[PDB]
Symmetry: D2
Subunit: 248 residues, 4 copies
């Protein structure tokens, strides 16, 4: 189909936004690699999105482990022979007052979100550099990445770091290798996990509703299209206007 012969890797692709993006790329005929930490969820996701035999590759791995990343790259290269797009979506988040956050809790989020995104990006980038592939990277961030994230200080710091990495790689690798690097910052999206009623935040969104995984997937698809080839080093926000000041 439209994305046929392209190979897309989505970390954290067995649930939520990751799986919504995975669904769209598979419907457009691309080969999709989804990663996760649990076998069962990956199998389920694969059964839900696979359009033809061999289209989807599930990889049980940890983005914090550089050996796992290299093994995944070798496995994909052997099965499909190329990698076109990397979407760094694997994340970990929960609320905790900053004073009460354990050192291990802080470390775990920085490790999965910031470090794991860098490990995946550098390893995939090096693969593209060696093969002369003009790849595309999309990093999932949050609107609190450029502001305050009260109650989620670990995620706010990690995602801010990811946003800086996004812009830095867009300049360095855009120039030296023609690799495009961008981010997406979603607002509240229906059908996603986490940790007095919802109308408390649906109200905070000017458009008065939650976004959908299909809408996020449409943005990801547009960013990977030939039309969008000049978009580089930006963060596309999709939050119905939530992050803006709602009163004067």
């Amino acid at each position: 189909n439209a994305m046929k012969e392209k190979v897309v890797i989505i970390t954290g692709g067995s649930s939520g936004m990751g799986k919504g993006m995975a669904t769209r790329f598979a419907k457009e005929g691309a080969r999709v690699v989804i990663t996760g930490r649990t076998k069962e969820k990956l199998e389920e996701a694969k059964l839900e999105i696979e359009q033809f035999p061999g289209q989807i590759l599930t990889v049980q791995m940890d983005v914090r482990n550089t050996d796992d990343i290299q093994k995944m790259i070798e496995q994909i290269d052997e099965k499909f022979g190329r990698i076109d797009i990397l979407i760094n979506n694997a994340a970990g988040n929960f609320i905790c007052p900053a004073e009460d956050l354990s050192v291990n809790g802080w470390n775990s989020v920085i490790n999965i979100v910031l470090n794991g995104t860098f490990y995946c990006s550098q390893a995939i980038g090096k693969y593209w550099i060696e093969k002369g592939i003009k790849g595309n990277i999309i990093n999932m961030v949050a609107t609190y990445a450029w502001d305050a994230g009260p109650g989620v200080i670990h995620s706010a710091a990690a995602k801010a770091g990811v946003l800086a990495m996004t812009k830095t790689l867009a300049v360095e690798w855009g120039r030296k290798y023609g690799i495009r690097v961008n981010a997406i910052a979603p607002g509240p999206i229906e059908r996603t996990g986490g940790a007095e009623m919802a109308k408390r935040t649906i109200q905070s969104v000017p458009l008065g509703r939650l976004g959908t995984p299909e809408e996020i997937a449409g943005l990801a698809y547009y960013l990977c299209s030939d039309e969008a080839a000049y978009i580089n080093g930006t963060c596309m926000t999709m939050d119905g206007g939530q992050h803006l000041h709602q009163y004067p």
Copy 2:
């Protein structure tokens, strides 16, 4: 579908304006292009029209509120609806801030900032009275949120337009379900202003090593108006190959 929609593009007879008009027309929308000169409007129409009467040319000035109401009336009478407004009409040139005439400064503030407000408010009120969930796209520049040396007039005006964009996304998004966003293009071929050492140097300044195109800009505006994009509101989408970012540490 896009086939039934009506799109207004101010300054639509040349440059990015015409690139956007070309795309919406190929997708079958009715397109209204505005401009100050009759000749350029007729040239653009002939070039982009897919079928008789698809394109409506309106010779007008975005600084004139009477021109804006006349245009709305004419469109409503002819097509019976308005779905999308793209505020593109612009004016720009280089001048050191201390040398800029009061008339030069005023003219750019009036066309870019005031004209965008006049058009947006008039169209918004038309949508409000008819219960239409419209969409507005404002064309800004990457210097709108930083410094614009040599183009202080445009930097100020476009910064005002960006603030307006975000403010209307909140006010109208909430009260009427009207979406408002902006596009910040980088250097785009076939859109030269007034003003090669610095020429090839500016291409060097773009990480991707090339100029953007009006067709790429048109594809972003088209995506922003699609049903898939319905949750995008109050943002500025930059399309500049990474140019506005720091190029060295």
Copy 3:
């Protein structure tokens, strides 16, 4: 060196303008305050003047380029120099964007954006002719870089001023050594859900704002250029996740 300096504060007869004027006069500078109404200027003068001839009141409109040149002539004749310009003259009120009259929108753009440009260009040219390394401080608002629901006129105007601030910081900083910066105040003294909205749990004060403007004009702050210093107790930041 403050003793030998001349500071111009537009809209200096009330509120923040008066707070700034009070501090600069206490530090011994000559202060020029502008305003539209005679009696308010006369009251402000009596309140802040520390010695005879310290304060020059000028009844003028920042939208009038002829008024600006007359003021510059008058200042130059009386004091012989101008060191600092604070563009504070502002106008503001709440109104839904779709209800705002063309005259209402135009008046705010004219006073805030155009007036700041007219004053800044006229003073810049004066400094350019005399080789003076001046300092400009523009008063903006935290909604200048975000949305300002209900105050779209002021948000647009202030955002324009912020862009002008950064642009002149580059052009004039490099060519003439003139520094240009902005201050963004939060809610300032002179129902309480907005006090709750401020992490520090209170309103700011005009004395605090004046202390920031004073620091920005000091020799210690000579490398600060093209930035916006916000003083709002943390209010503009997201208060929830």
Copy 4:
């Protein structure tokens, strides 16, 4: 509340900006604690900065080690009985193309700059919470923290994370404890030693010169003064206008 009665901690206080800040606070009469990894540098800085015996406390410690941090707080509390200000300055930075950066290299910068700043801030904050002290935190960032940092991707990410932390703590702790948290972003400063011609750098600064440690010190001192009590959750840039676009 008078500076003469205050205790100021400056990590990385034995050289460069840290020492410039140390010099100013000591000159105003505060007790100053400077941290560093080398005994000799610490003793040299102490001799240079101290106005009276016992005014300066040097602490040889690693900001990445939470035990070192805990021991330092005990030592200061025992000697001085209070802590008023924390300046997170310790940092590590060098140039390296993103694709050539080692995993250890990346990890070390994130650890020292981002994690170390969180460890010190959380530990000192907890100390302040226990004692009811309305403390003040200043984090040293850089202007590439909110943009691209080509060649310094590690520091750009770490510093972006520090900036997010700064804003997040200003909200959470400003509200719950009256603790202020702000950042400073310096431009190029003479006498600071991080790892073509230098006239290129001064040329990129509109003001056409480098900043000084004494200027940076004045900004830090202003931010800690009583008149700056309402400044919270912001980043004060001191770079001569360098980070702005220099041409259309």
